[PDB]
Amino acid sequence: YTARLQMVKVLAVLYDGGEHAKQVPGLLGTTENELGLRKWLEDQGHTLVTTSDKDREGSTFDRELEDAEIIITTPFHPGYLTAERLARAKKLKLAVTAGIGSDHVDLDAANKTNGGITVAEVTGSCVVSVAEHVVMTILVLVRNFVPAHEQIEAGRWDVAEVAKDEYDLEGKVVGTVGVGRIGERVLRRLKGFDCKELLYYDYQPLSPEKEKEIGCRRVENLEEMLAQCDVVTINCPLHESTRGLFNKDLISKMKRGSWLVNTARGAIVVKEDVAEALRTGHLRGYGGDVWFPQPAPADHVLRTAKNPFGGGNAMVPHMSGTSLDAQKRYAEGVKRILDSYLSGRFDYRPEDLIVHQGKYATRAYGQREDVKI
Amino acid sequence: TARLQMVKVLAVLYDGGEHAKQVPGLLGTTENELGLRKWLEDQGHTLVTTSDKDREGSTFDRELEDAEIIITTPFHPGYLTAERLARAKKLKLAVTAGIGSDHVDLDAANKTNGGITVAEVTGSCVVSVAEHVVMTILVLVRNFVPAHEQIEAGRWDVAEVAKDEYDLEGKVVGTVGVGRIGERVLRRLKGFDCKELLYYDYQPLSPEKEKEIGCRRVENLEEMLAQCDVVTINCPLHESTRGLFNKDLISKMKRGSWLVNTARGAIVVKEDVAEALRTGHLRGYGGDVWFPQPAPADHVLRTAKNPFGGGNAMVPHMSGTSLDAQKRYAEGVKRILDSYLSGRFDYRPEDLIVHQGKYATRAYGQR
Ligand SMILES: NC(=O)C1=CN([C@@H]2O[C@H](COP(=O)(O)OP(=O)(O)OC[C@H]3O[C@@H](n4cnc5c(N)ncnc54)[C@H](O)[C@@H]3O)[C@@H](O)[C@H]2O)C=CC1
Ligand SMILES: NC(=O)C1=CN([C@@H]2O[C@H](COP(=O)(O)OP(=O)(O)OC[C@H]3O[C@@H](n4cnc5c(N)ncnc54)[C@H](O)[C@@H]3O)[C@@H](O)[C@H]2O)C=CC1
């Protein structure tokens, strides 16, 4: 016997589904459907407050976080837990990410907050979804789909106009920054396309057995990998050493006319340096689903920046990790993490923990001293 | 062997305009002529190239009357109708710069000038297309197009586009045709962990390839359609595939399924695809092929949508004319021309569609 925790205040910050969340009940991660948690929490005597109002001065988020014991966020509409907000979150013990990537929490501040809060996410819930979105985005860019589709819809016909930037993925070199759950799954899906080579850069390598099974090669230096690739995909977390990593200087190490894909986090790239590299034709293409901040401001430059030929943009809202198949998995995973806390067992899956008991509980947010697994 | 002399070659290709000068790799254009001009002229042959192929009294219609070799390309097809073949008094060889020779009336070709040779560059485009299929499948399944439009219009609503966003993992994909393209489609889908990979073809894969790829042969086309989330069409256009994907056959697909067609436009009935999208029987349709080509400016599949404003991943006929493919089919056309002009007639058998008055392929129907 362990005594369950009692009358726990849960705050969820999710995106509004409006009428969509009634047309399609599969939109679990919405303010309407509340990850299917409400009855489950209420039957135990806990309380749930859900909001999408998270950015403005005096937001519902800012009011409710002051006495929430558990805060659920979602990367697709992230309640930013800044040092200022954590300092006001007097009751906070557990911050759960409905999805993957907890960089919208100040993790260093979380470690110094209320004796060190637990920051957990649903590891593996979104990873296939994102890896497929990567391969899709790589092909969309390489085969110059977007301007071709626009030509059709506008009632025009000019095959040369869009074939002149159309390549095959076969015989191209593809590198991944990060070979964790997503980066390894990207390479697994690119195996069948007979790329000239599959490269990776990561301070946590694949086993030799997995390198030969997939057919990929570890590059020890990031700039040396960029110089060899036709395609680069970013699949690492956002932490101090990856914030603004893809600046003008690093992008200039990519090949002229290369393709860049970023489904990881917006703030890993410098948005003005991506736009200038596309506009001068150093990049042929940029695409992905992640932005900083989110929601992306209406005038964000990567909404509309193009290569010199009028193509090269394959951006979408932050959706790959919130496909209807991913939402079923991270909704179930959030309930599992909540049960670990509310039971008083604190029997978390170790791979779900980002920070815990005042220390980083992961090796994936930078190379660290003081990592306790 | 005595070489043939002073041969009149006619090429019907697409115009590259300024594009074919920005990008010299656009070989399959009227500007760059597949890199053939000097090669032909140094042998004493002549080349006439045009993109003018549709109107009454077109350059094509004038020049085909005494052309001995006609080069066409599927991306801008000189239609060799029975009427035109009847006037092509000197025609001996029709070469397709790419793959798919259905723009030639092959039955008429067999009865023309003692049976003309119709050859194409087998294998030149097949990876290109297979990549384009998987791309199109992901674009539809993941609801990319309206999501990209939302971003470019300065809007932000994740639910609006996530409500029709699925993963390809755990879906059933079926190919109509498991030849060079359909087999390469399944080889690219293997790493996505689909629930099952199916095929329908009267020429099966070997057991060893079924086990290696991890796919299953379905004996009946309608029974395969009933089991699939996604359907891709990878067969040639011939009498038994023309209008195959009509309302009755599409109604055997699952409600909310996705249909890809990189094969040939005329294999689908365009009004029946548009109606199935309109009512939500299909979630999506996409591909690069149309009938006729150029696609009329009002073709219904330019603008047909699902009930949510998505589900259209159409492009012009480009997948087989990627810059990597053009290098391969340009080299292949030169090889086929050398077989004829040398007087050896030593064609690769797999390049032959009709020859010596007979079909030379099993892939244009069971004969
Ligand atoms: N677009 C979307 O919806 C989603 C995006 N994400 C993002 O993807 C990131 C990675 O996800 P997973 O692969 O599941 O996590 P993971 O923890 O399994 O793998 C990440 C890898 O990145 C490596 N890494 C860290 N810093 C790096 C550096 N400077 N250079 C190279 N590699 C570095 C780590 O060592 C680790 O092997 C997430 O942290 C999140 O930011 C994940 C899921 C949803
Ligand atoms: N979008 C593009 O740029 C391109 C499109 N294509 C088209 O795709 C077609 C196929 O290309 P490949 O795979 O290289 O040809 P292939 O000849 O290697 O294979 C075609 C397969 O279709 C099968 N087939 C014929 N009728 C069928 C039916 N009713 N049902 C099921 N399967 C049937 C054949 O038995 C054969 O196995 C070409 O004939 C051409 O129309 C190919 C290249 C370029």
Swiss-Prot record, chain A:
The record marks 265, 318 as: Important for catalytic activity. NAD(+) binds at residues 181-182, 202, 237-241, 263, 289, 318-321. It catalyses: formate + NAD(+) = CO2 + NADH. HAMAP family: Formate_dehydrogenase (MF_03210). One of its GO terms (molecular function) is formate dehydrogenase (NAD+) activity. Thermostable up to 55 degrees Celsius. Homodimer. Belongs to the D-isomer specific 2-hydroxyacid dehydrogenase family. FDH subfamily. This is Formate dehydrogenase. Optimum pH is 5. One of its GO terms (cellular component) is cytosol. It comes from Chaetomium thermophilum (strain DSM 1495 / CBS 144.50 / IMI 039719) (Thermochaetoides thermophila). The keyword ATP-binding does not apply. It is found in: Cytoplasm. GO terms for biological process: formate catabolic process. It holds the Pfam family 2-Hacid_dh_C. Keywords: Cytoplasm, NAD, Oxidoreductase. Its EC number is 1.17.1.9. The keyword Cytoplasm applies. The gene is FDH. InterPro entries: D-isomer_2_OHA_DH_cat_dom, D-isomer_DH_CS, D-isomer_DH_CS1, D-isomer_DH_NAD-bd, FDH_NAD-dep, NAD(P)-bd_dom_sf. Substrate binds at residues 100, 126. PROSITE patterns: D_2_HYDROXYACID_DH_1, D_2_HYDROXYACID_DH_2, D_2_HYDROXYACID_DH_3. Catalyzes the NAD(+)-dependent oxidation of formate to carbon dioxide. Formate oxidation is the final step in the methanol oxidation pathway in methylotrophic microorganisms. Has a role in the detoxification of exogenous formate in non-methylotrophic organisms.
